[PDB]
């Protein structure tokens, strides 16, 4: 009797009745609407608001047109109820599109510009919901709603503020719409609302400004008109709200795309905040902050200040984040940005443990991380004063097998590093040891790169052979007398 399993599996699903968007009920409300009698229309509006409040689905033209018609009313009750109904229906994705196609934006804008704060709230909110569909965003942005949205973002009523700033946020997702926002004058408002004591408003405005900072032109504009923006974001890095912390950090990263902001964030005291955030052991916070410091470390004038601030060891520790490839990449990239600085910073770099950790990661990490590490080694090897030390950390053990990689960032930078390590060093012991190992070591490298199609690789091989000859060493001169090496020409 397996059947009685099935017998109750069906009844169950026959369960999985409150639908009134058609037939009798709908016709009754519609009849109330087209009566053009004020009281009856009030009744219809209240009914619609309640119904949409309790249940929402994709509805047809005949549901939305009586509501749109109710939105032409001068009566506050009708207005607020109809706006509530349309706003509720605008939670469904097909409804958003249909509502905008029917010309709902014009009545909504009109209702926004009236002196009724509840109607303001509901109309703005309806627009907020409409703007969560990509198709609608540009149409809303160019419809004229931006001026009243910007104005209403300054409302003393927190619900109106949330809806307004939310809509503004919903139109920072494309370059064009962001341009529309900046042209409508939203930026001073957003910046001012960075100080808001409401978590939602603060988050919306922080995120909105962060998205606005994605565009170079907006960054330039902000640099000219909003001089205290960096300070405010910096102070927002210490917000008790985690998402506001994270987003403020992201905004600072985005801004740090530019040189001037790279200097300005440091000048405004952002470094200790970043130092703390990069050690939070919260993946979002760490990601944001390591990205930010990655951008900031590009400016030479910051290097010293970054090392004094104590970034090196936190950065090095980030390399143990084996389940976050991006964090590893950014950490290593920042380290490499700190790898060709002054002597003090160099000593600090070597005292951080970056070389050893990078060596450890070089042969057991994603190819992106490998690439960053390889580049880091390549730049580190440029300093003569460091070469021996790099050699005594046995990084040749990493470099040599990396010259086998089909990723040319890896292999190319490994070749560069190795080559430079072979040049003008006082002691060639480590090089002699690594002549045949690992994996044919340095001689094998020389062979393979001597027969390379890519003229740069071949140039590298020839150049490092020359550097090996150039140095006054008796034995490496003995080791180059092997026939696979020489007749290459």
């Amino acid at each position: 009797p397996i059947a009685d399993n099935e017998r109750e599996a069906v009844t169950l699903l026959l369960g999985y009745q409150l639908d009134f968007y058609s037939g009798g009920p709908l016709k009754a409300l519609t009849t109330l609407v087209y009566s053009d009698n004020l009281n009856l229309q009030r009744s219809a509006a209240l009914a619609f608001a309640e119904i949409t409040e309790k249940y929402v689905r994709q509805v047809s033209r005949e549901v939305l047109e009586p509501i749109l018609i109710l939105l032409q009313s001068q009566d506050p009750q009708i207005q607020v109820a109809a706006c509530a109904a349309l706003g509720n229906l605008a939670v469904n994705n097909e409804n958003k599109l249909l509502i905008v196609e029917m010309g709902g934006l014009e009545p909504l804008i009109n209702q926004m510009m009236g002196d009724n704060v509840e109607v303001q709230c509901n109309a703005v909110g309806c627009i907020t919901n409409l703007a969560t569909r990509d198709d609608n965003k540009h149409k809303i942005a160019t419809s004229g709603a931006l001026i009243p949205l910007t104005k209403l973002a300054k409302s003393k009523h927190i619900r109106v503020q949330r809806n307004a700033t939310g809509a503004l946020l919903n139109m920072t997702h494309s370059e064009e719409n962001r341009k529309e926002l900046v042209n409508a004058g939203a930026v001073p408002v957003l910046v001012s609302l960075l100080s808001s004591t409401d978590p939602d408003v603060q988050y919306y405005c922080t995120t909105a400004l962060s998205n606005i900072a994605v565009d170079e032109a907006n960054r330039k504009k902000l640099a000219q008109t909003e001089p205290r923006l960096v300070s405010k974001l910096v102070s927002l890095m210490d917000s008790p709200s985690s998402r506001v912390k994270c987003q403020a950090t992201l905004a600072l990263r985005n801004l740090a795309s530019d040189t001037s902001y790279q200097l300005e964030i440091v000048r405004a005291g952002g470094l200790p905040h970043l130092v703390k955030l990069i050690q939070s052991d919260s993946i979002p916070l760490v990601l944001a902050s390591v990205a930010c410091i990655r951008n900031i470390s590009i400016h030479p004038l910051n290097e010293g200040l970054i090392v004094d601030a104590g970034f090196l060891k936190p950065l090095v520790r980030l390399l143990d984040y084996k389940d976050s490839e991006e964090i590893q990449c950014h950490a290593v990239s920042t380290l490499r940005n700190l790898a060709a600085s002054s002597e003090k910073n160099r000593k600090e770099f070597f005292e951080s443990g970056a070389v050893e950790k990078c060596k450890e990661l070089a042969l057991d990490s994603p190819v992106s991380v490998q690439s960053e590490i390889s580049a880091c080694f390549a730049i580190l090897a440029l300093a003569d004063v460091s070469k021996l030390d790099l050699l005594e950390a046995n990084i040749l053990d990493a470099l040599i097998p990396m010259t086998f990689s089909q990723n040319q960032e890896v292999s190319g930078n490994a070749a560069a590093a190795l080559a430079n390590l072979c040049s003008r060093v006082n002691n060639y012991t480590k090089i002699i040891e690594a002549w045949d190992r690992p994996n044919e070591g340095i001689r094998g490298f020389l062979i393979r790169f001597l027969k390379s199609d890519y003229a740069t690789f071949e140039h590298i091989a020839l150049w490092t052979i020359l550097q090996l000859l150039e140095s006054h060493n008796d034995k490496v001169e003995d080791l180059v007398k092997n026939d696979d090496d020489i007749i290459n020409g």
Binding site: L46, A49, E53, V80, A81, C83, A84, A85, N88, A90, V91, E118, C121, N122, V124, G125, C126, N129, T132, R159, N163, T165, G166, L169, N170, T172, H173, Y204, T207, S210, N211, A213, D215, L250, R253, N254, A256, S257, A291, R294, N295, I298, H330, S333, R336, N337, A375, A378, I379, L382, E409, G412, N413, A415, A416, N420, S423, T456, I460, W463
Partner: peptide, 30 residues
């Protein structure tokens, strides 16, 4: 001829990222 370098000294700046999280309205009173 003094050194070999196949990568830029500094690494590239990251592209600014957009947060695509969407805001929704507050509950509607009527």
């Amino acid at each position: 001829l003094l050194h070999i370098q196949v990568s830029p000294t500094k690494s590239s700046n990251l592209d600014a990222q957009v947060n695509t999280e969407q805001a929704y309205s507050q509950p509607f009173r009527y």
